[PDB]
Design a protein around this ligand. Structure first.
Ligand SMILES: NC(=O)C[C@H](N)C(=O)O
Ligand SMILES: NC(=O)C[C@H](N)C(=O)O
Ligand SMILES: NC(=O)C[C@H](N)C(=O)O
Ligand SMILES: NC(=O)C[C@H](N)C(=O)O
Lengths: 354, 356, 356, 354
């Protein structure tokens, strides 16, 4: 047997109608009991299992998967989620780390990529799978993507030792800190633009073991609650005025991700550059990410954004750059130089160096 | 014969190295003369053509294509381009509209999509092709995408009557107000996420005539120099504080595109909503666009951003929403309600209205 | 407001079981489906005291309630053992019960699914109701599968929409049956419609391409063609293929052949090979030229293009469709060879796009 | 400096109109001289180079590339090409192997994949790049894919040590024995369904060095002219009769690739199986390949084709299986069992083992 904790945070996967809009819906365990694909009643009574614990039917070979549903309260649309919510989740995983062989987190799609990236950083030396999943259509609606997304997540966590925060949707397993949402209606909602999926499910299950990270058995799990809140994201647009940037970068901001044009460029007008420079003197750290979905930030142009306190984000997603910025700035007693060096390193598989 | 104007604004297609970085490079016409694929010397002398005018070799069928190079000054990296630059370009097209059968604009990739969208709006009732093109690698570098991108743009403008601001790159013609940049290194740099290409070039040329807009022969070209400058784009991120939004939306801002999560949603925390409401009372107009590349903004959630002075952008790119916002706000003597109604309408093929 | 469907279970991996360490066809489908809430609403069934043969889907978002009856063919087959006769039997089942039901779903193996869809497309002349083929890469009895959602989707499409075509539903896509081919032997996205958009897509909502879906011909009755010519074949060219091997392949009693050719529709121009094609034509054989390429059309243009006596271009047809069309046309009674060739060159069921 | 041989065999890249159809067109070197992108006149006179030898302009970094055009005669539409033509090409490469650092072969698209795969096998222990290229539109037609396809091939051969028979088209370098033609009109005409490209050209050049084969500097080049001609390809279709298969497999055929359904299956009707068995007793070797573009042949069904003298082709393209069959059967003095063992091995990067 293998034992999993299913953490239900909210999201469309479990929503219900009310006032003609979808809102978070409680009572997930109650529903799941009634579904044979999610709970084997015969086996449960045959082992007289507890009322909190469900049991997946069997695969021919390999371990039986059991899981316990922890329903957060209140449940949230992922658009209302913040760093504090993700810290709460990490702490749940920390509290119960020893009792369970893996974790599945049901989450809304709207900020799924931010959440996956954040947990990726907070959960240092992670040894077990943490699989985020969600859906475009609620599980209570007959034609949905929820059933197979939830089952796949449970089967991955239950059967494979992939020590990473992942996202499972639409028969693909992605590295969590590598994904971003590309489609607001279709079931293929997420893309991992700069890295293959860690796994694919079809007639058989193909895992890219060459990419999956190695379990560091010696080192214990260190959960970082010390994530810096005063970080932001700022997207450049043509003609963006210096005075607006000045305002954006005022104290108490400590870090910012600048989403720039193309290979990592912005306007070279001096008043703008002066503000970035002024912000650096105040001790602000800036990460340069491209607005483009695919490719890497690279120097080469007179418009390339480089300089004091600007670290290139290379091929990072913006969700990952923001989380990494939150993580690095939250570490105690480091110099600015050191912090910049940590930002330029691949810390959780989120960044490919040249 | 068909006559085109080639407007060279800058961009990597024509850049040179200096101090180990790429910068804008002048002297394009001088280079193009020396390249047989871009200038047929034999034919030029046989017709004793002017020194400013180049001539493509014969294509398979149809008319011979001649073109004139207008090299803007100063040439720009597209990251330094603004509304005023795009207005200058529209005015060049206006000045010479009657002398030429079509236009090609060489432009940097960095803000290409913004430029295409802006010109799309400024050039009301356009009857001729305006094809933007660019490259990831300069034409002076041997291994490049510049040669074939420039040639294709000239051949499309020269041979087909597509009355739209388009982007031609990597054997695809896209509707200008429908594109966005998706790859910062690869030659397939742009995507039209919510509309097929207008055309594809291969062994033969396939055009989607069912999508191409109709020439309005009766109506004259109206160029809009009256584009509102005080518009911005603001991307939401989780936990974005109300105080930062307050600062962003201070006067003199008149319009903003909010890039929101998923199907068009944001945080429902009251202090944030309060600021959007306060901005509306100051008369600000807000367009809701999705951060997602593909799909549409749609209501359905308690977190859907809708309300006073918020217009849904449906499936618009953010580049298009920003340009449309600049256009609509620049029109004289309209009420806020009228302006909102215009934003919710498909004005240049940039927006698809939902089905029933 | 109820709609009634017939679910015809022919075999295929969707319903297979292990035996001797290999998958083989598994009976007892209705017994399984009863126990699954997503496939049978027990509460509603007792509330209407329904028959034991008839299952009932839960309520979908809108529209009619869907009821269906399972007909389990015997013997059940791996689709690799299926032939024209099996597909004729299926067509006849649909004929027998045509009046009692509003639509049809056929569970079928993937191995020859495309051939089966194309064949039924031709046999069912003037079809007025949906016939949706579906299958799976993993059996429904195996926990982690594509079977559950593929079967449900097929039932919901047939049950809710009037698409009068033989279709294939897999992996949230509805394809025109005579337009598909199998591209992936392991992944759930197993089929592609290379030269036509899907007829429909399922997501948060259902998008149908009504401007492609064929029109119901309510005047004309259903005519089922049992008269399908069995002596037809498919022959794939490979470089250096010798004339003597082709001679042997095309011996009587063969009446028709699909030649899968290179590129835009080309083959070796060596005379001994051309002589055999010509000899076959004199014996009265008909030949259809299809490209080995997945995407594109057969077109003339090269000295190696295969054209001539009794060779009809297949344009953009799949080879599964060309073979079925060849079987259909050759089975029609009392037509000249010239007439038969004219019919092959026409789009008879939406399988072929004519040039302009 | 680096020196390349450009072998022009024919194909649309160099065709001309005549009688309203395209046919092979001579005089390539004459055309190339007049194009600055393909020949630097200033530099040539500055080094008073020979009349047979062209010189590319300077690329960004590295060596200057010079090349010599060898125009085969007669030139061919690739639909007329056979094993003998490919042997002639291999022999050209063998004759001049020491004088040149790499090779480019201009070839028609129609049988490009068969040609690439054949040369891949004939050129044992190859140490230098051999890059096939072609086009959908002739180079003499103004709007074409020929110019950039030919240049890219020269630049790859000229600048990188990739010791494989490759195909360069549309800014992608593919392993030759891994490609097949998927589009008869579009410039993206070829696909490598079961293997990433070896390289991609964009703003910079990305090579997948983890996939590129290693130069075997100890071992000399062995060219195999001994390629078995009596091999064929047979595609199954539903209901294919046993009597037609009987006829197909008659002597003197020595080997066949059976293109089967799905994961590698065919009809189980006994009269058909009997003929495969009869062919095996005559000593015929059979390779099972899938008709599907993507995936692998695998057992699992009662309809799986396995047995006496049937070797699984796993994820091989059919072009590659046919060439491998031609190669293995041409080797002198091996037992049937040995031959089968060689077929089941990855000999040139054409097959992925489980
Ligand atoms: N499909 C979803 O989950 C969207 C939802 N608004 C959420 O993120 O909570
Ligand atoms: N590829 C390019 O053109 C990038 C350049 N920085 C520009 O936009 O001008
Ligand atoms: N997945 C499948 O259905 C393949 C099976 N051999 C069949 O065609 O019946
Ligand atoms: N485009 C091409 O090269 C096709 C031509 N028929 C050939 O194979 O020679």
């Amino acid at each position: 047997e293998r034992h999993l904790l299913l953490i239900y945070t909210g999201g469309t996967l479990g929503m219900q109608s009310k006032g003609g809009v979808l809102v978070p819906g409680p009572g997930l365990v109650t529903l799941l009991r009634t579904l044979p694909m999610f709970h084997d009643k015969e086996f449960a009574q045959a082992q007289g299992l507890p009322d909190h614990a469900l049991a997946l039917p069997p695969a021919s070979h390999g371990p039986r998967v059991l899981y316990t549903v922890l329903e957060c309260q209140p449940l949230l649309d992922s658009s209302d989620m913040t760093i504090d919510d993700w810290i709460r989740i990490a702490k749940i995983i920390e509290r119960h780390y020893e009792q369970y062989q893996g974790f599945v987190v049901i989450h809304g799609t709207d900020t799924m990529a931010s959440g996956a990236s954040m947990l990726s950083f907070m959960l240092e030396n992670l040894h077990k799978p943490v699989i985020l999943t969600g859906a475009q259509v609620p599980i209570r609606v007959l034609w949905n993507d929820a059933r197979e997304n939830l089952l796949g997540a449970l089967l991955v966590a239950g059967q494979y030792i992939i020590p990473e925060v992942c996202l499972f949707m639409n028969s693909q397993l992605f590295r969590g800190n590598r994904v971003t949402m590309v489609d607001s209606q279709k079931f293929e909602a997420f893309c991992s633009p700069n890295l293959s999926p860690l796994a694919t499910v079809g007639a058989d299950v193909t895992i890219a073991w060459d990419l999956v990270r190695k379990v560091k058995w010696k080192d214990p799990l260190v959960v970082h609650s010390n994530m810096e809140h005063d970080v932001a994201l700022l997207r450049l647009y043509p003609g963006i005025p210096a005075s607006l940037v000045r305002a954006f970068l005022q104290p108490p901001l400590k870090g910012v991700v600048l989403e720039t044009f193309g290979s990592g460029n912005g306007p070279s007008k001096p008043d703008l550059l002066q503000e970035l420079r002024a912000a650096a003197q105040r001790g602000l750290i800036m990460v340069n990410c491209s607005q483009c979905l695919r490719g890497s930030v690279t120097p080469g142009y007179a418009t390339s954004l480089a300089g004091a306190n600007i670290v290139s984000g290379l091929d990072m997603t913006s969700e990952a750059a923001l989380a990494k910025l939150s993580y690095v700035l939250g570490l105690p007693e480091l110099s600015l130089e050191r912090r910049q060096e940590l930002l330029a390193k691949d810390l959780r598989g989120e960044m490919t160096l040249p």
